Amino acid sequence: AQSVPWGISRVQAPAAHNRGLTGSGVKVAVLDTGISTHPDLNIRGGASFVPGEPSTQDGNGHGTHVAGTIAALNNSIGVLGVAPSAELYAVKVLGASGSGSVSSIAQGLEWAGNNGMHVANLSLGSPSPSATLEQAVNSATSRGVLVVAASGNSGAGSISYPARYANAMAVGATDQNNNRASFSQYGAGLDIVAPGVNVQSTYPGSTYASLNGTSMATPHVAGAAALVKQKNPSWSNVQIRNHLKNTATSLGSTNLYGSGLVNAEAATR
Numbered sequence: 001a002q003s004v005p006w007g008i009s010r011v012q013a014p015a016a017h018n019r020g021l022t023g024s025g026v027k028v029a030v031l032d033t034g035i036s037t038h039p040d041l042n043i044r045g046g047a048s049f050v051p052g053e054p055s056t057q058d059g060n061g062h063g064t065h066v067a068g069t070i071a072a073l074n075n076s077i078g079v080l081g082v083a084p085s086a087e088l089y090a091v092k093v094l095g096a097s098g099s100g101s102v103s104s105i106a107q108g109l110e111w112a113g114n115n116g117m118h119v120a121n122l123s124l125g126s127p128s129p130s131a132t133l134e135q136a137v138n139s140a141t142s143r144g145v146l147v148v149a150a151s152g153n154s155g156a157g158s159i160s161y162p163a164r165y166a167n168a169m170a171v172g173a174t175d176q177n178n179n180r181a182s183f184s185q186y187g188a189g190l191d192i193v194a195p196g197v198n199v200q201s202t203y204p205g206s207t208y209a210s211l212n213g214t215s216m217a218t219p220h221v222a223g224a225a226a227l228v229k230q231k232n233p234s235w236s237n238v239q240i241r242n243h244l245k246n247t248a249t250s251l252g253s254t255n256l257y258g259s260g261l262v263n264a265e266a267a268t269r
């Protein structure tokens, strides 16, 4: 029995799936704590940039969780991703403890840019800016990667790095009411929002678990981008990012919500 988590249908991925759009041929890199082998996931490759954890398997559960929001397989078990046919690559830039260095994160993006990744998912952040990080962001961007990052969970009216950088697509979190979740950082650089409360997904030990955060919202956007990329194979990172924003559902102030809630139905139209 397969269930469709609420944010998947909130963003209207099924509407897109019903038109032949599943993210097929789109390469998506998850820069996180790894992705564990799971019966509802198809991991195509990856690398680890965490000294001391040479494997890409997830010792934390955070990346496995994020990954399933993007691409949990559409079959008869578990859950369902926004882009269930996306090619998923596990890029480990965060250790088991759930933290990493800017160095490891910048190496992951470098890797993404060098390996022709179309979308990079960075459900991570820091309140502090990093010149290293920023350059990596910009580099992956000129290599044609769309970088999608979490705004953070401090609840403050200013967003984290790298989401704050012009070249990153900053994602905030909404609740089932289509209100901004209290922890969701907002303000300048915020581009769009997505479901980030009680998000059910894939978890290590072949199970499913629900989490809260902008980390959970980000992957709905990364997925949404793969759907559009499949529909418009000639579009660049910028064209996708703008189409997403242009087709989002307004939810109120752009200070709080940026463009509004991502809408994969409106976007693959």
Ligand SMILES: [Ca+2]
Residues within 6 Å of the ligand: 002, 040, 072, 073, 074, 075, 076, 077, 078, 079, 080
């Ligand atoms: Ca499934």
Ligand SMILES: [Ca+2]
Residues within 6 Å of the ligand: 163, 164, 165, 166, 167, 168, 169, 170, 189, 190, 191
């Ligand atoms: Ca931004």
